[PDB]
Ligand SMILES: O=c1ccn(-c2cccc(C(F)(F)F)c2)nc1-c1ccnn1-c1ccccc1F
Ligand SMILES: [Mg+2]
């Protein structure tokens with residue numbers, strides 16, 4: 001009987017795809033719990049275990065410009081919006097597991113790509129050949145679940161528990177952008193040839209993978225002032241990695257070179273054309289109520305074209 005409520009403006013705004021969670025860090029746990037309750041009921045988690053899990057997850061996010069606690073909660077909110085707009089499509093286990101996956105998808109990120117770990121010869125690159133950081137994020141998730149008082153899935157049978165951790169694992173692995181290209185191409189073809197079947201677990205996994213990409217890229221679907229300021233954080237990370245590449249004696253790609261800041265607007269165009277528009281396009285074909293994400297993405301592309309033309 002202990003509901004969560006948000007002030008009127010947030011209560012209304014949080015149902016929308018383009019919601020910004022605000023600068024008050026101390027409200028984000030309350031926002032997450034609010035979203036879990038409206039997404040799978042007040043019963044599905046023990047409130048004292050859930051709060052303990054959230055604070056341990058927060059502790060294990062680092063103070064990096066972009067891949068921080070704020071990103072985690074932004075990505076979870078976008079999944080909440082997708083689940084609330086496609087209510088009857090997903091199971092009780094998928095709903096429970098996917099919000100947790102989004103909150104944990106970047107645990108212990110230091111602000112470096114898999115590519116820099118490979119070139120630095122980091123121990124995580126020996127432990128994990130592909131999806132280095134994403135296999136690490138899932139390891140960290142399992143660690144926090146195994147702390148005393150943190151098992152939020154305590155009332156799930158052994159079958160259910162293994163199912164929910166396999167959803168979480170695949171959801172987190174899918175946030176490796178290198179895997180997105182193949183996954184989206186295969187979903188496009190299954191849709192065009194009419195073979196896509198949401199009763200096939202194999203096709204379901206691909207669809208959840210695309211949802212995870214969409215949630216992870218969702219900064220490109222905000223209102224222009226939020227999109228434009230988040231790009232400052234994204235490039236702060238990229239340029240830091242560029243600097244570390246130069247210390248290994250490797251020329252960074254231009255995107256990561258802080259000496260080529262002039263090329264940013266043209267580079268965003270590339271990304272919107274090559275990644276973001278194709279992602280939300282294919283997602284809207286499979287889940288029509290996610291149209292607003294595609295609309296907002298197109299809006300922001302047109303804003304970057306105005307920046308290139310000095311408007
Ligand atoms: O603004 C952006 C410009 C470039 N890239 C980007 C990133 C990786 C590979 C590539 C590739 F080389 F594949 F093109 C492009 N991404 C963004 C961007 C927008 C939102 N999130 N996000 C983003 C940030 C960090 C890591 C992954 C991301 F996805
Ligand atoms: Mg990641």
Ligand SMILES: [Zn+2]
Nearest residue numbers: 071105106216
């Ligand atoms: Zn992420």
